[PDB]
Amino acid sequence: DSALSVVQNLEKDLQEIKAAARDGKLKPLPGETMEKCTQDLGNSTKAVSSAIAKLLGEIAQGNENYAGIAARDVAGGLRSLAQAARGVAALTSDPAVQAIVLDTASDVLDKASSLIEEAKKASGHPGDPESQQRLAQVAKAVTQALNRCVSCLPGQRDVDNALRAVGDASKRLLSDLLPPSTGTFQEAQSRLNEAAAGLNQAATELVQASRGTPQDLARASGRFGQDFSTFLEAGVEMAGQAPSQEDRAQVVSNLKGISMSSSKLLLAAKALSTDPASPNLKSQLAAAARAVTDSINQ
């Protein structure tokens, strides 16, 4: 119940932030800084998400004081989210940016209030799967709102949007697509090897700019994305010319594996654009690059 009351307190803080947006001004706290704000937002996203997971688990057990414990937990996580969003508002200059932060945060937290009362019901009433499924779907919704929140930064958004675009191009390219200009196996496959070389090369500069600056990371990732686009279409022309249908399916499988490789790749790339510090996940990025190279090699 207090966690509820708290979502209302967060809404009042969001209203104070909305008034600051009308004033067109929000002085950052002496401590808060934009990069630390990035760290704040990302860590808080992870934290609140895991806290929601605790909510799911406790309700799966159902009827537990620990449920209210994790309720307070998600509440505090939202409070931290509020700190992060407040800072990012207090530092940006684009009006639409702070509008977005207000909006995303508000949606997260109102959906969260829905979660609060729904889990209150869950606590009151035992024995109904439908409550569990409802909880599941609302948690998914709040997670999507979270993804919006993180994606609020523009430079992040396009390149992950580029990621989605290339994945979708592969997916439309996946429904048994067959291109007309079959061409010849030889020059096509050789250029395909060149493109793969360029792709994991691009990954190497991606990690280079992971030692560097974010905007450069973004543009390099975009170059990577379009390169992989040409690469995937080269794969589909391979399929179009393929003598064998099983050979065709194998090439398609390789290409889709490369697709998911690059997917996890740029996922890590953004998860690091989160923070110029955390070296763990930078090594994880290196691992992702290795896996992408593995798909290339196969």
Partner: protein, 60 residues
Amino acid sequence: SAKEVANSTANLVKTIKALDGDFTEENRAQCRAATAPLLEAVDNLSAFASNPEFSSVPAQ
């Protein structure tokens, strides 16, 4: 979390024991309807893995 994974894993076990040799899309629907709950269990796993303050103690 691990227990829900184990139960969904048993559901998998029946999916294997049933899908074997039938080629009946009813068994295939059964298998995917069992993998989905394991999929959300995986999701819970991933979220837990994402526990930031409970993730790393980097050196200096």
